[PDB]
Design a protein around this ligand. Structure first.
Ligand SMILES: *[C@@H]1O[C@H](CO)[C@@H](O[C@@H]2O[C@H](CO)[C@@H](O)[C@H](O)[C@H]2NC(C)=O)[C@H](O)[C@H]1NC(C)=O
Ligand SMILES: *[C@@H]1O[C@H](CO)[C@@H](O[C@@H]2O[C@H](CO)[C@@H](O)[C@H](O)[C@H]2NC(C)=O)[C@H](O)[C@H]1NC(C)=O
Ligand SMILES: *[C@@H]1O[C@H](CO)[C@@H](O)[C@H](O)[C@H]1NC(C)=O
Ligand SMILES: *[C@@H]1O[C@H](CO)[C@@H](O)[C@H](O)[C@H]1NC(C)=O
Ligand SMILES: *[C@@H]1O[C@H](CO)[C@@H](O)[C@H](O)[C@H]1NC(C)=O
Ligand SMILES: *[C@@H]1O[C@H](CO)[C@@H](O)[C@H](O)[C@H]1NC(C)=O
Ligand SMILES: *[C@@H]1O[C@H](CO)[C@@H](O)[C@H](O)[C@H]1NC(C)=O
Ligand SMILES: *[C@@H]1O[C@H](CO)[C@@H](O)[C@H](O)[C@H]1NC(C)=O
Ligand SMILES: *[C@@H]1O[C@H](CO)[C@@H](O)[C@H](O)[C@H]1NC(C)=O
Ligand SMILES: *[C@@H]1O[C@H](CO)[C@@H](O)[C@H](O)[C@H]1NC(C)=O
Lengths: 235, 215, 96, 168, 48
C-alpha cells in the first residue's frame, strides 16, 4: 500500500509531472528509476549533485532544471574545501563587509471568537436546550478562545511595548553618513509607516456566528512603538 | 538598498511569517466548512432538521449534530491552543528579538543574524515582527606565519590583546580580526616565567621606546 | 483545490495493488451438518429443560431454511442472515 | 486506509464525516516536515562542508575520538561511530514510516564540518569565511574571554593538553 | 546551543554544561544531538 505524490516544478512554469509512489517497489504494476524513498516514474536520474529544490526523501531531490525535464539529484550538501592548516600558519582578514540580514517571526494571530451556543445549536431555542445538558463544554470552549485572544493581545504587548516613552527622531539628518530614510517614518505617507515597512504590509494579504475581535493595538499604534525603538537606538 | 529590492521582488521573506497566516486561515476555513458536513445526521443545516422533525426524533438528531459539532469545535480549540502556544514562544523570542538585538549588543554568536551583531532594527509586519540585523563579517584573509611566545632575554612575552603575526621578515602584533601591525613593545606585552617551557617560540627583538629617547 | 499550483511535492491519492484472484480454501470435508433431526423431530423437552445439540465437523447450508418452511419469526441478531453462507464459525449450538 | 480499511463500503461513511480524514493527514505531514526541518535548522549551520585537515597536529590536543575515521565505513567518529553501535544494541500496516530528508550519512558530514570548522577556523567560520588559526592560539582567545590571561594557557599548554586528552 | 556554543564562546553562565565555557563539539545520534562541552574550573585555593 502506498501514497502517491506528484512532483511539480510549478503550474506556471510547466505542465510536466513526476510521480513517486511512496514505498512501493519500482517493478510493481505498470524511466522508472528506483530510489530508496519509493519508486519515481517520470524523472531522469542524473549523476551530478545540486542544491535541494523539490525535496523527496532519503537524499533525492527533484528540480525542473538540468529541452526541459524533471531530474532527481542526490542532494550533496556543500562544496568540500579544507582550510589550509599548520601549527605555524595563521590567517587574518584585511577587509571587512557589513551586511544586513532579516529574520521574520510571528507575534500574533486573529483573535477569533466563537459563541458556543450559536454555532453548535444555531438560532433555535429548542436545539440550545439540548446543548445545556452537556454543560461545561460550551463555556470551556469560549474561555479557551478568549484566553488565546488575550494572549494574542499580550504577546504583542510583550514584544513591542518595552519602552515607556515614545522617543521621536531629531529633524537633523546628521547621522554620520548613514541613510536611515527608508527604515524611519515618512511624514508624507499615512500611518507613519516606514518605506521598508510599507512593502511588508503590501506583500501579506458576524459571518456565521464566528467573530474576529479587533486587535487591542492598531497597526498604526504598533508602527509607533517600532518607530520609537528604532528612533531610540540611533539617537 | 538591496534589502528594499529583495523585499519588493519576492514573497519569500514573509513565507516564514506568511505560512503562519495561511495556516491559521486554512484551519478556520475547514472548520467553517465543517458546518456543511452531515456527521451522520439526516441533513446538515440545523434549522432544516428542526423544521421537519418532531421533538423526540428531533432530539436524537440534534444530539448527533451537537456531538459531531462539539467534536469539530474541540478540534479547533485544541488546534488553536497549540498554534497559540507556538506563536507565544515566537513573541517571547519575538519580544526578545524586539528588545535584545535592539537594546544592547548580543555577544552570542548567530543568535541575532549571522556573524557579529553590531546593531539591529525592527520593522512591523502584519501579525509579525521583522528584524533587520547588521553584522560584521571579515571578507579577506592573508596568510601569515605565527608563534605563541617571543623569547627576548630568556623571558617570553605574550600579546596583551592580539595574536603574534609575522609576514616572515619581522614579527608584529595585530588584532586577530583586522590586520593592523604594531611593532612589538613592552606596552603590548607582559613577561611571565622563562622561555624554555612554551612549545612554540620565536626569538625576536623588543623596542623599549624609552631607551632611544633617554639617550 | 486550486487551478494554479506552486512548485512542490503534493500527495494526492493512495495506491493499492488490487488482488489478481480470489482464493477460497474451505475445509475438504464433504459430510454435511443436519438441521432436520433438531428442527423436524418427534418431540422436544420442557422450556425449563433444553438440549444443546452441538454441531461440528460438517458443511452447513441456510438457503434451504428460507422457503422450505415459512417461519413465523426470523430475527438474525449480530449477523445478516443472507451472508451466513460465506464465513466459517466455531462450535455452533442449537437449542429447542 | 486505517479507519475504513480495504472495503469500499466502509469508505463511503468516512466521506460523510467530512474533512476530518483529510485534516488529520495534513497535521501529520506538518509534523513530518518539522522533524526533517528541525534537523535542517540544527545541523545546516554551515554553508560549505570543510574537509578535516590531513595533518593531525592539534597543538598537543588529541581529537581522534571526535573526528571521523576514513578507514571506517560510513564516516562516523569513534564517539559517533560507537553511538550508532550502542543505539543498535539498544508498510507493515496502515502505517508508513517515511524516511528523513537527511540521511544519517549526510548528518555525519554536517557534524564533521562543524568539528572541522571549529578546530581550523575558531569562531570565524560562524560569522563568515572561515579563517585558519593555530589551535593553541585559538585556545588563547578562549581563555581571554573567560578572564584567564592567555599567557596562562601558553605557560602550561602541555599540562592543559594532557588533561583535555585524558578528559576526552 | 549549536549556534550559540559551537560557533563561538558563550558568555551566559551554565548555558554550556557547568562552569566557565571554552568551546563545544557537536555530535550526532539517531534523533538527537550530543554536545561535548569544554569548561574551565578553578581546582585549588589559597587564602589571601
Ligand atoms: C575593502 O572592501 C571595500 C568594499 O569592497 C573596498 O571598497 C571598494 O574598493 C574598490 C577598489 O578601490 C572601489 O572601486 C569600490 O568603489 C569600493 N567600494 C566597494 C563597495 O567595492 C575597499 O577598497 C577595500 N579595501 C580597503 C578599505 O582596504
Ligand atoms: C424439514 O421439514 C421440511 C418441511 O416439511 C422438509 O422440506 C421438505 O422436504 C421434502 C423431502 O426432501 C421435500 O420433498 C419437500 O419439497 C420439502 N418441503 C416440504 C414443505 O415438505 C425438510 O426436508 C425437512 N428437513 C430439514 C430441512 O432438515
Ligand atoms: C523489487 O523487486 C525486485 C524483484 O526482482 C527485487 O529484485 C528488488 O530487490 C525489489 N526491491 C524492493 C525495494 O522491493
Ligand atoms: C593560505 O593557504 C594556502 C595554502 O595553499 C596559500 O597558498 C594561500 O596563500 C592561502 N589560501 C587559502 C587558505 O586558501
Ligand atoms: C537617503 O535616501 C533618500 C531616499 O532614497 C534620498 O532622497 C537621500 O538623498 C538619501 N541620502 C541622503 C544623504 O539624504
Ligand atoms: C611584512 O611583509 C610585507 C610583505 O612582504 C611587507 O609589505 C612589509 O613591509 C613587511 N614589514 C616590514 C616592516 O617591512
Ligand atoms: C609544527 O609541526 C611540524 C609537523 O611536521 C613539526 O615538524 C614542527 O616541529 C612543528 N613546529 C612547531 C613550532 O610546533
Ligand atoms: C633562539 O635563541 C635560542 C637561545 O637559547 C637558541 O638556542 C636558538 O638556536 C635560537 N633560534 C633561532 C632561530 O634564532
Ligand atoms: C591520538 O590517540 C590515538 C589513539 O591511540 C593515537 O593512535 C594517535 O596516534 C594519537 N594522536 C595524536 C596525539 O595526535
Ligand atoms: C581559608 O579559610 C579556611 C578556614 O576554615 C581554611 O580552612 C582554608 O585554608 C581556606 N578556605 C578555603 C575554603 O579554601
Amino acid at each position: 500500500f502506498g501514497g502517491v505524490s506528484v512532483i511539480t516544478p510549478g503550474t506556471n512554469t510547466s505542465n510536466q509531472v513526476a510521480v513517486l509512489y511512496q514505498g512501493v517497489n519500482c517493478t510493481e504494476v505498470p524511466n522508472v528509476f528506483q530510489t530508496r524513498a519509493g519508486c519515481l516514474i517520470g524523472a531522469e536520474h542524473v549523476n551530478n549533485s545540486y542544491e535541494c529544490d523539490i525535496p523527496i526523501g532519503a537524499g533525492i531531490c527533484a528540480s525542473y532544471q538540468t529541452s526541459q525535464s524533471i531530474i532527481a539529484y542526490t542532494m550533496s550538501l556543500g562544496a568540500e574545501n579544507s582550510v589550509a592548516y599548520s601549527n605555524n600558519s595563521i590567517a587574518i582578514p584585511t577587509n571587512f563587509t557589513i551586511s544586513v540580514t532579516t529574520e521574520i517571526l510571528p507575534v500574533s494571530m486573529t483573535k477569533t471568537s466563537v459563541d458556543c451556543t450559536m454555532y453548535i445549536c444555531g438560532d433555535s431555542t429548542e436545539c440550545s436546550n439540548l446543548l445545556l445538558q452537556y454543560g461545561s463544554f460550551c463555556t470551556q470552549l469560549n474561555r479557551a478562545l478568549t484566553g488565546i485572544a488575550v494572549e494574542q493581545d499580550k504577546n504583542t504587548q510583550e514584544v513591542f511595548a518595552q519602552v515607556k516613552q515614545i522617543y521621536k527622531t531629531p529633524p537633523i539628518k546628521d547621522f554620520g553618513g548613514f541613510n536611515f530614510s527608508q527604515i524611519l517614518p515618512d511624514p508624507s505617507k499615512p500611518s507613519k509607516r516606514s518605506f521598508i515597512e510599507d512593502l511588508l504590509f503590501n506583500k501579506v494579504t458576524k459571518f456565521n456566528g464566528l467573530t474576529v475581535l479587533p486587535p487591542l493595538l492598531t497597526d498604526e499604534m504598533i508602527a509607533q512603538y517600532t518607530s520609537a525603538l528604532l528612533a531610540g537606538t540611533i539617537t | 538598498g538591496k534589502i528594499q529590492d529583495s523585499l519588493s521582488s519576492t514573497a519569500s521573506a514573509l513565507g516564514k511569517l506568511q505560512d503562519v497566516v495561511n495556516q491559521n486561515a486554512q484551519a478556520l476555513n475547514t472548520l467553517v466548512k465543517q458546518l456543511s458536513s452531515n456527521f451522520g445526521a439526516i441533513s446538515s443545516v440545523l434549522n432544516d432538521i428542526l423544521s421537519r422533525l418532531d421533538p423526540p426524533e428531533a432530539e436524537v438528531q440534534i444530539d448527533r449534530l451537537i456531538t459531531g459539532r462539539l467534536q469539530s469545535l474541540q478540534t479547533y480549540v485544541t488546534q488553536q491552543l497549540i498554534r497559540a502556544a507556538e506563536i507565544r514562544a515566537s513573541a517571547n523570542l519575538a519580544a526578545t528579538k524586539m528588545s535584545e538585538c535592539v537594546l544592547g549588543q548580543s555577544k552570542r554568536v548567530d543568535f541575532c543574524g549571522k556573524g557579529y551583531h553590531l546593531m539591529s532594527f525592527p520593522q512591523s509586519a502584519p501579525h509579525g515582527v521583522v528584524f533587520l540585523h547588521v553584522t560584521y563579517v571579515p571578507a579577506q584573509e592573508k596568510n601569515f606565519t605565527t608563534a605563541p611566545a617571543i623569547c627576548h632575554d630568556g623571558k617570553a612575552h605574550f600579546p596583551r590583546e592580539g595574536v603574534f603575526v609575522s609576514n616572515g621578515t619581522h614579527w608584529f602584533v595585530t588584532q586577530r580580526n583586522f590586520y593592523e601591525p604594531q611593532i612589538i613593545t613592552t606596552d603590548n606585552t607582559f613577561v611571565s616565567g622563562n622561555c624554555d617551557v612554551v612549545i612554540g617560540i620565536v626569538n625576536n627583538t623588543v623596542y623599549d621606546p624609552l631607551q632611544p629617547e633617554l639617550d | 483545490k486550486s487551478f494554479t499550483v506552486e512548485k512542490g511535492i503534493y500527495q494526492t491519492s493512495n495506491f493499492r495493488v488490487q488482488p489478481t484472484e480470489s482464493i477460497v480454501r474451505f475445509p475438504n470435508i464433504t459430510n454435511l451438518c443436519p438441521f432436520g433431526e433438531v428442527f423436524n423431530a418427534t418431540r422436544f423437552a420442557s422450556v425449563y429443560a433444553w438440549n444443546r445439540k452441538r454441531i461440528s465437523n460438517c458443511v452447513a447450508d441456510y438457503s434451504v431454511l428460507y422457503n422450505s418452511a415459512s417461519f413465523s419469526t426470523f430475527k438474525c441478531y449480530g449477523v445478516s442472515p443472507t451472508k451466513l453462507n460465506d464465513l466459517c464459525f466455531t462450535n455452533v449450538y442449537a437449542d429447542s | 486506509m486505517y479507519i475504513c480499511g480495504d472495503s469500499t463500503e466502509c469508505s463511503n461513511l468516512l466521506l460523510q464525516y467530512g474533512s476530518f480524514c483529510t485534516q488529520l493527514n495534513r497535521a501529520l505531514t506538518g509534523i513530518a516536515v518539522e522533524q526533517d526541518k528541525n534537523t535542517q535548522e540544527v545541523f545546516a549551520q554551515v554553508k560549505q562542508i570543510y574537509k578535516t585537515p590531513p595533518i593531525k597536529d592539534f597543538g598537543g590536543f588529541n581529537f581522534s575520538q571526535i573526528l571521523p575515521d576514513p578507514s571506517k565505513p560510513s564516516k562516523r567518529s569513534f564517539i559517533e561511530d560507537l553511538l550508532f553501535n550502542k543505539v543498535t544494541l539498544a508498510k507493515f500496516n496502515g502505517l508508513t514510516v517515511l524516511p528523513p530528508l537527511l540521511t544519517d550519512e549526510m548528518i555525519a558530514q554536517y557534524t564533521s564540518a562543524l568539528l572541522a570548522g571549529t578546530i581550523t577556523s575558531g569562531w570565524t567560520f560562524g560569522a563568515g569565511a572561515a579563517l585558519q588559526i593555530p589551535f593553541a592560539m585559538q585556545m588563547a582567545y578562549r581563555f581571554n574571554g573567560i578572564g584567564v590571561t592567555q599567557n596562562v594557557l601558553y605557560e602550561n599548554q602541555k599540562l592543559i593538553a594532557n588533561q583535555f586528552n585524558s578528559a576526552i
